[PDB]
Amino acid sequence: ELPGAEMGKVIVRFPPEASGYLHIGHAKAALLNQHYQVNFKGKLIMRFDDTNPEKEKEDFEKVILEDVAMLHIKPDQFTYTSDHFETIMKYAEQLIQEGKAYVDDTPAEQMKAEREQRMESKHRNNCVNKNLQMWEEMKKGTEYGQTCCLRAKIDMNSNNGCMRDPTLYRCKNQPHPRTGTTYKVYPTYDFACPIVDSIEGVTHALRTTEYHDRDEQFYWIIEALGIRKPYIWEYSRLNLNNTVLSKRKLMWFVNEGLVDGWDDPRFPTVRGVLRRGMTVEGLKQFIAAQGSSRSVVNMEWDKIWSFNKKVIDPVAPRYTALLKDAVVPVNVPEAQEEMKEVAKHPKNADVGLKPVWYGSKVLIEGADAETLTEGEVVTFINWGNIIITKLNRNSSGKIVSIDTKLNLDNKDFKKTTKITWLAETPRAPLIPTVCVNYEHLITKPVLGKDEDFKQYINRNSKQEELMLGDPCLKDLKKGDIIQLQRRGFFICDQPYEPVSPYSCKEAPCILIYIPDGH
Amino acid sequence: QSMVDEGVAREVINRIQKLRKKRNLVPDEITVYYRSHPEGDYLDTVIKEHTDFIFATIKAALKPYPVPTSKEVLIQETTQLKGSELEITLVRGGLCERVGPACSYVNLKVCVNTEQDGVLLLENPKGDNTLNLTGLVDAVSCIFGLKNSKLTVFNGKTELINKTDLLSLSGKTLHVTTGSAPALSPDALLCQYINLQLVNAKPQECQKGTVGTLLMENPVGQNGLTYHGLLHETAKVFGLRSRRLKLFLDEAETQEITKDISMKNLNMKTVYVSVIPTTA
């Protein structure tokens, strides 16, 4: 919950940077923000942080709006940091004119040295007029202004590095995507953020606990300017095992070709994670269950998948896929070709019915075949009890064929083995399907500090298996979540396509295994 | 006088490489097209007889006009030489060697209700998804719009069996009828086609081969392949439907196949398929 929060009067913002793709960490922040917006009937600002005309591009902006849409997040307002450039500049000039900010031409590396050694720069005590003259050089973009930055005059002696006169503004002759060349001077995030949260009316600024040092800085700027003070609510950063979240680390997988790209189902981007079979609601319930916790736990991926498994289980239709290579033909001579409709779901009659086809020519898993004995009563799922009569083997002792007798008046289902099966009939041809299983990209769950993820790359993180699918799979569409009986939950990544005139082959239904929490 | 004509051929050669130096091009796969306007006159004679010599010292090929509508012109100069006018155009990438179909195929004459011509690839990519007689009948039914209506496949005058090895008939023409061997077998594929060579990456969806073939029409004159269709079908062949693909006319990857290519240009050419990361 939120201190200082009133119904209808909460205002939160999600302020990504459009430097790349949203990942599950950004997903948490956006969903936590949305949670407070919905539960308090407040407003959610989606603010592009475009303080930097060099770290953003129009390219990731669109990406980011799609990711937010995919999370079913509907911001009430869309703003940019650049929308307030004018006002931010004026607050900088206010601080200069009050001795609270000065301009420094000290080269950056020396500047970080002195900042490191609690050493005041030569400029800290400049009179207002000399500061205003150097500030003029940055505004005009002169080559001398370009080496100058505006610093806040706080405390070079603070334990809080973030308080040792932080840079508020820099001079970049760069043209800006939305403001063009109006400004040769650009505020830092540290400086822009408290101001824009105050302007836009933000009552609760959610930051990850890793920003905690900057809260002191945040509030100094607010007070030094004397403006609306937003409340900072701190939630724990998402630490997932076997997982890295840094763009520079994720990028290495892309560049090394270990991964398909940013929407790869092994990536923790929201794109990849949804492709993997995570649902928004499963994500939404996981965030809500731990809410605003400040303890930075090492989260296990399984704990999210268990929340997801609860969401898809009640509604995912059940279908059958058999491992193509090992399938064993079964003779059911008494059976006639017919079709009956049968429940798609074992506990929720809402999901509806599927057609099942029966006939004398049937296929079962080789793994199941090798566990059968002659004279055993076996339940063929959605059919009934069938007596195994002959197990036909070849010269090597491999079952190559199974003969059966129907036993459908025997309605005893207590101790029978219950196996999946598919009929071979031209009236309902089997659908070629590929099952894809993904593993983690990093084999070590928790990296200690000073440890390099590149030593624990999983080089076998994708496996594909060729299946004979349920005829109903031909109508799956990308995104449909289903259950392969006795195998698990799967999401359709690519649908089946009928024989092409150009390639003379079908395209298989591609199903990705959805981790369930075990 | 052959040393006189060789010295003129060297002047064309010198003309060509000065153009290479104009576009900062450094030996860069290129092609050189030429036109000596007073046709068959002196300078045109020289350049044709000495084409091997020119090719040997300018390590690019030397074909005459016209430049393909598909290639991007690097430079185009017209100067004079020994009473002819001499047009040189330099274009990116080497040539486009036409090759036979990479996958085993079968020409199809389908006489049920008129005669229809087409091709059926028996594998795709090469080495995978090899076809059964039953698979062939199904494929013929989908593509040609037939029901499994007493559908009989004839190799010449024999009828094929669920045991016939279709691959061993790879060059041949088969007859699909309603149960009545025909009378009366072409050589060339009845349909335009392209070959596909995967270069960047390995096929997925448990496929295996790195070379494939796409017909550009099936049956003949029906179902013209479009540019966007080629992208999708390329992906289907190798199991790269999730991936972003770039198609190139050379293996150097400099003549990129583009949405304003003319599809007929591609016929019998090997298209080179490159997988790139899905970024934004």
PDB file of N, CA, C and O in Angstrom, chain B residues 207-249:
ATOM      1  N   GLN B 207      14.467 -29.270 -39.483  1.00  0.00           N
ATOM      2  CA  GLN B 207      14.997 -29.420 -40.831  1.00  0.00           C
ATOM      3  C   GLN B 207      16.519 -29.502 -40.762  1.00  0.00           C
ATOM      4  O   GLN B 207      17.135 -29.319 -39.710  1.00  0.00           O
ATOM      5  N   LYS B 208      17.140 -29.708 -41.915  1.00  0.00           N
ATOM      6  CA  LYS B 208      18.529 -30.141 -41.894  1.00  0.00           C
ATOM      7  C   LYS B 208      19.358 -29.573 -43.043  1.00  0.00           C
ATOM      8  O   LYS B 208      20.467 -29.062 -42.838  1.00  0.00           O
ATOM      9  N   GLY B 209      18.851 -29.674 -44.258  1.00  0.00           N
ATOM     10  CA  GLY B 209      19.589 -29.162 -45.384  1.00  0.00           C
ATOM     11  C   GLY B 209      19.691 -27.653 -45.363  1.00  0.00           C
ATOM     12  O   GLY B 209      18.895 -26.943 -44.746  1.00  0.00           O
ATOM     13  N   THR B 210      20.703 -27.163 -46.070  1.00  0.00           N
ATOM     14  CA  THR B 210      20.960 -25.740 -46.196  1.00  0.00           C
ATOM     15  C   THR B 210      20.713 -25.242 -47.605  1.00  0.00           C
ATOM     16  O   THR B 210      20.954 -24.068 -47.887  1.00  0.00           O
ATOM     17  N   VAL B 211      20.243 -26.102 -48.500  1.00  0.00           N
ATOM     18  CA  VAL B 211      19.891 -25.708 -49.854  1.00  0.00           C
ATOM     19  C   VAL B 211      18.460 -26.144 -50.121  1.00  0.00           C
ATOM     20  O   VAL B 211      18.056 -27.248 -49.742  1.00  0.00           O
ATOM     21  N   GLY B 212      17.691 -25.271 -50.772  1.00  0.00           N
ATOM     22  CA  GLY B 212      16.314 -25.569 -51.088  1.00  0.00           C
ATOM     23  C   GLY B 212      15.942 -24.997 -52.438  1.00  0.00           C
ATOM     24  O   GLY B 212      16.754 -24.364 -53.116  1.00  0.00           O
ATOM     25  N   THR B 213      14.691 -25.212 -52.805  1.00  0.00           N
ATOM     26  CA  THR B 213      14.200 -24.756 -54.087  1.00  0.00           C
ATOM     27  C   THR B 213      12.774 -24.271 -53.902  1.00  0.00           C
ATOM     28  O   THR B 213      12.009 -24.857 -53.137  1.00  0.00           O
ATOM     29  N   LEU B 214      12.416 -23.195 -54.582  1.00  0.00           N
ATOM     30  CA  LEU B 214      11.042 -22.729 -54.598  1.00  0.00           C
ATOM     31  C   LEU B 214      10.578 -22.652 -56.040  1.00  0.00           C
ATOM     32  O   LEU B 214      11.233 -22.021 -56.868  1.00  0.00           O
ATOM     33  N   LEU B 215       9.467 -23.298 -56.352  1.00  0.00           N
ATOM     34  CA  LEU B 215       8.826 -22.987 -57.612  1.00  0.00           C
ATOM     35  C   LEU B 215       8.257 -21.581 -57.506  1.00  0.00           C
ATOM     36  O   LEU B 215       7.921 -21.118 -56.414  1.00  0.00           O
ATOM     37  N   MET B 216       8.171 -20.888 -58.643  1.00  0.00           N
ATOM     38  CA  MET B 216       7.612 -19.540 -58.680  1.00  0.00           C
ATOM     39  C   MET B 216       6.174 -19.521 -59.171  1.00  0.00           C
ATOM     40  O   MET B 216       5.561 -18.448 -59.235  1.00  0.00           O
ATOM     41  N   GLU B 217       5.617 -20.690 -59.473  1.00  0.00           N
ATOM     42  CA  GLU B 217       4.282 -20.862 -60.021  1.00  0.00           C
ATOM     43  C   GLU B 217       3.933 -22.337 -59.915  1.00  0.00           C
ATOM     44  O   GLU B 217       4.812 -23.188 -60.062  1.00  0.00           O
ATOM     45  N   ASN B 218       2.669 -22.630 -59.640  1.00  0.00           N
ATOM     46  CA  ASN B 218       2.180 -24.006 -59.592  1.00  0.00           C
ATOM     47  C   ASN B 218       0.663 -23.993 -59.468  1.00  0.00           C
ATOM     48  O   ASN B 218       0.116 -23.396 -58.532  1.00  0.00           O
ATOM     49  N   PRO B 219      -0.059 -24.583 -60.421  1.00  0.00           N
ATOM     50  CA  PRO B 219       0.455 -25.152 -61.665  1.00  0.00           C
ATOM     51  C   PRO B 219       0.982 -24.065 -62.580  1.00  0.00           C
ATOM     52  O   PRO B 219       0.911 -22.889 -62.200  1.00  0.00           O
ATOM     53  N   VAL B 220       1.494 -24.442 -63.752  1.00  0.00           N
ATOM     54  CA  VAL B 220       2.088 -23.459 -64.653  1.00  0.00           C
ATOM     55  C   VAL B 220       1.115 -22.311 -64.890  1.00  0.00           C
ATOM     56  O   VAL B 220      -0.078 -22.528 -65.119  1.00  0.00           O
ATOM     57  N   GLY B 221       1.612 -21.075 -64.776  1.00  0.00           N
ATOM     58  CA  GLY B 221       0.791 -19.895 -64.982  1.00  0.00           C
ATOM     59  C   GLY B 221      -0.161 -19.534 -63.861  1.00  0.00           C
ATOM     60  O   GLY B 221      -0.767 -18.458 -63.911  1.00  0.00           O
ATOM     61  N   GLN B 222      -0.317 -20.374 -62.852  1.00  0.00           N
ATOM     62  CA  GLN B 222      -1.113 -20.026 -61.688  1.00  0.00           C
ATOM     63  C   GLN B 222      -0.212 -19.683 -60.507  1.00  0.00           C
ATOM     64  O   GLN B 222       0.934 -20.135 -60.421  1.00  0.00           O
ATOM     65  N   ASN B 223      -0.740 -18.851 -59.608  1.00  0.00           N
ATOM     66  CA  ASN B 223      -0.147 -18.647 -58.288  1.00  0.00           C
ATOM     67  C   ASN B 223       1.249 -18.032 -58.376  1.00  0.00           C
ATOM     68  O   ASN B 223       2.198 -18.494 -57.735  1.00  0.00           O
ATOM     69  N   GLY B 224       1.368 -16.974 -59.169  1.00  0.00           N
ATOM     70  CA  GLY B 224       2.619 -16.247 -59.236  1.00  0.00           C
ATOM     71  C   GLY B 224       3.173 -15.878 -57.869  1.00  0.00           C
ATOM     72  O   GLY B 224       2.507 -15.228 -57.051  1.00  0.00           O
ATOM     73  N   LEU B 225       4.390 -16.328 -57.599  1.00  0.00           N
ATOM     74  CA  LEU B 225       5.064 -15.929 -56.374  1.00  0.00           C
ATOM     75  C   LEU B 225       5.283 -14.419 -56.360  1.00  0.00           C
ATOM     76  O   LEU B 225       5.743 -13.840 -57.347  1.00  0.00           O
ATOM     77  N   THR B 226       4.929 -13.781 -55.243  1.00  0.00           N
ATOM     78  CA  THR B 226       5.209 -12.372 -54.999  1.00  0.00           C
ATOM     79  C   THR B 226       6.502 -12.221 -54.200  1.00  0.00           C
ATOM     80  O   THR B 226       7.070 -13.197 -53.705  1.00  0.00           O
ATOM     81  N   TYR B 227       6.958 -10.970 -54.063  1.00  0.00           N
ATOM     82  CA  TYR B 227       8.152 -10.697 -53.266  1.00  0.00           C
ATOM     83  C   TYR B 227       7.933 -11.090 -51.804  1.00  0.00           C
ATOM     84  O   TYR B 227       8.723 -11.842 -51.224  1.00  0.00           O
ATOM     85  N   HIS B 228       6.868 -10.569 -51.189  1.00  0.00           N
ATOM     86  CA  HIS B 228       6.561 -10.911 -49.806  1.00  0.00           C
ATOM     87  C   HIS B 228       6.330 -12.411 -49.632  1.00  0.00           C
ATOM     88  O   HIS B 228       6.682 -12.979 -48.591  1.00  0.00           O
ATOM     89  N   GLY B 229       5.734 -13.067 -50.629  1.00  0.00           N
ATOM     90  CA  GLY B 229       5.593 -14.509 -50.561  1.00  0.00           C
ATOM     91  C   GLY B 229       6.927 -15.222 -50.565  1.00  0.00           C
ATOM     92  O   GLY B 229       7.125 -16.189 -49.827  1.00  0.00           O
ATOM     93  N   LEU B 230       7.862 -14.756 -51.390  1.00  0.00           N
ATOM     94  CA  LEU B 230       9.201 -15.335 -51.404  1.00  0.00           C
ATOM     95  C   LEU B 230       9.853 -15.263 -50.027  1.00  0.00           C
ATOM     96  O   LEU B 230      10.517 -16.216 -49.585  1.00  0.00           O
ATOM     97  N   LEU B 231       9.675 -14.145 -49.331  1.00  0.00           N
ATOM     98  CA  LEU B 231      10.232 -14.030 -47.992  1.00  0.00           C
ATOM     99  C   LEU B 231       9.624 -15.074 -47.067  1.00  0.00           C
ATOM    100  O   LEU B 231      10.333 -15.740 -46.305  1.00  0.00           O
ATOM    101  N   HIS B 232       8.306 -15.237 -47.136  1.00  0.00           N
ATOM    102  CA  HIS B 232       7.634 -16.164 -46.241  1.00  0.00           C
ATOM    103  C   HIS B 232       7.995 -17.593 -46.587  1.00  0.00           C
ATOM    104  O   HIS B 232       8.269 -18.408 -45.697  1.00  0.00           O
ATOM    105  N   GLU B 233       8.024 -17.907 -47.877  1.00  0.00           N
ATOM    106  CA  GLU B 233       8.302 -19.269 -48.309  1.00  0.00           C
ATOM    107  C   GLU B 233       9.750 -19.650 -48.035  1.00  0.00           C
ATOM    108  O   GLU B 233      10.039 -20.782 -47.628  1.00  0.00           O
ATOM    109  N   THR B 234      10.674 -18.724 -48.258  1.00  0.00           N
ATOM    110  CA  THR B 234      12.056 -18.951 -47.857  1.00  0.00           C
ATOM    111  C   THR B 234      12.134 -19.351 -46.392  1.00  0.00           C
ATOM    112  O   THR B 234      12.829 -20.310 -46.025  1.00  0.00           O
ATOM    113  N   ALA B 235      11.409 -18.618 -45.539  1.00  0.00           N
ATOM    114  CA  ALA B 235      11.412 -18.905 -44.111  1.00  0.00           C
ATOM    115  C   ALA B 235      10.817 -20.282 -43.832  1.00  0.00           C
ATOM    116  O   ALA B 235      11.340 -21.033 -43.005  1.00  0.00           O
ATOM    117  N   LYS B 236       9.726 -20.628 -44.524  1.00  0.00           N
ATOM    118  CA  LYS B 236       9.097 -21.928 -44.328  1.00  0.00           C
ATOM    119  C   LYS B 236      10.048 -23.051 -44.693  1.00  0.00           C
ATOM    120  O   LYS B 236      10.114 -24.072 -43.997  1.00  0.00           O
ATOM    121  N   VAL B 237      10.791 -22.890 -45.786  1.00  0.00           N
ATOM    122  CA  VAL B 237      11.649 -23.980 -46.240  1.00  0.00           C
ATOM    123  C   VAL B 237      12.634 -24.366 -45.146  1.00  0.00           C
ATOM    124  O   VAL B 237      12.795 -25.550 -44.819  1.00  0.00           O
ATOM    125  N   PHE B 238      13.290 -23.373 -44.542  1.00  0.00           N
ATOM    126  CA  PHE B 238      14.350 -23.663 -43.589  1.00  0.00           C
ATOM    127  C   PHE B 238      13.887 -23.620 -42.141  1.00  0.00           C
ATOM    128  O   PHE B 238      14.701 -23.859 -41.255  1.00  0.00           O
ATOM    129  N   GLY B 239      12.606 -23.352 -41.877  1.00  0.00           N
ATOM    130  CA  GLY B 239      12.153 -23.282 -40.505  1.00  0.00           C
ATOM    131  C   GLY B 239      12.612 -22.041 -39.770  1.00  0.00           C
ATOM    132  O   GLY B 239      12.882 -22.101 -38.562  1.00  0.00           O
ATOM    133  N   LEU B 240      12.708 -20.910 -40.474  1.00  0.00           N
ATOM    134  CA  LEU B 240      13.132 -19.637 -39.915  1.00  0.00           C
ATOM    135  C   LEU B 240      12.004 -18.616 -39.852  1.00  0.00           C
ATOM    136  O   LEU B 240      12.269 -17.420 -39.971  1.00  0.00           O
ATOM    137  N   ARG B 241      10.748 -19.059 -39.669  1.00  0.00           N
ATOM    138  CA  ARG B 241       9.616 -18.128 -39.728  1.00  0.00           C
ATOM    139  C   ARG B 241       9.702 -17.064 -38.644  1.00  0.00           C
ATOM    140  O   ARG B 241       9.225 -15.942 -38.846  1.00  0.00           O
ATOM    141  N   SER B 242      10.302 -17.374 -37.498  1.00  0.00           N
ATOM    142  CA  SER B 242      10.461 -16.321 -36.494  1.00  0.00           C
ATOM    143  C   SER B 242      11.521 -15.297 -36.869  1.00  0.00           C
ATOM    144  O   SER B 242      11.519 -14.187 -36.326  1.00  0.00           O
ATOM    145  N   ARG B 243      12.446 -15.655 -37.747  1.00  0.00           N
ATOM    146  CA  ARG B 243      13.650 -14.872 -37.945  1.00  0.00           C
ATOM    147  C   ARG B 243      13.428 -13.781 -38.987  1.00  0.00           C
ATOM    148  O   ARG B 243      12.527 -13.857 -39.823  1.00  0.00           O
ATOM    149  N   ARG B 244      14.249 -12.744 -38.914  1.00  0.00           N
ATOM    150  CA  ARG B 244      14.294 -11.759 -39.977  1.00  0.00           C
ATOM    151  C   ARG B 244      15.341 -12.195 -40.998  1.00  0.00           C
ATOM    152  O   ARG B 244      16.456 -12.584 -40.629  1.00  0.00           O
ATOM    153  N   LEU B 245      14.966 -12.164 -42.272  1.00  0.00           N
ATOM    154  CA  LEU B 245      15.788 -12.682 -43.350  1.00  0.00           C
ATOM    155  C   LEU B 245      16.167 -11.547 -44.283  1.00  0.00           C
ATOM    156  O   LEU B 245      15.401 -10.598 -44.462  1.00  0.00           O
ATOM    157  N   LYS B 246      17.350 -11.654 -44.873  1.00  0.00           N
ATOM    158  CA  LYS B 246      17.730 -10.831 -46.009  1.00  0.00           C
ATOM    159  C   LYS B 246      18.114 -11.739 -47.171  1.00  0.00           C
ATOM    160  O   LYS B 246      18.868 -12.704 -46.997  1.00  0.00           O
ATOM    161  N   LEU B 247      17.578 -11.445 -48.347  1.00  0.00           N
ATOM    162  CA  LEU B 247      17.854 -12.230 -49.539  1.00  0.00           C
ATOM    163  C   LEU B 247      18.830 -11.467 -50.420  1.00  0.00           C
ATOM    164  O   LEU B 247      18.646 -10.266 -50.666  1.00  0.00           O
ATOM    165  N   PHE B 248      19.869 -12.165 -50.880  1.00  0.00           N
ATOM    166  CA  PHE B 248      20.911 -11.589 -51.721  1.00  0.00           C
ATOM    167  C   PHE B 248      21.077 -12.399 -52.998  1.00  0.00           C
ATOM    168  O   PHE B 248      20.954 -13.632 -52.991  1.00  0.00           O
ATOM    169  N   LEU B 249      21.390 -11.685 -54.091  1.00  0.00           N
ATOM    170  CA  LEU B 249      21.666 -12.306 -55.384  1.00  0.00           C
ATOM    171  C   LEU B 249      23.083 -12.849 -55.491  1.00  0.00           C
ATOM    172  O   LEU B 249      23.321 -13.739 -56.314  1.00  0.00           O
TER     173      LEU B 249
END
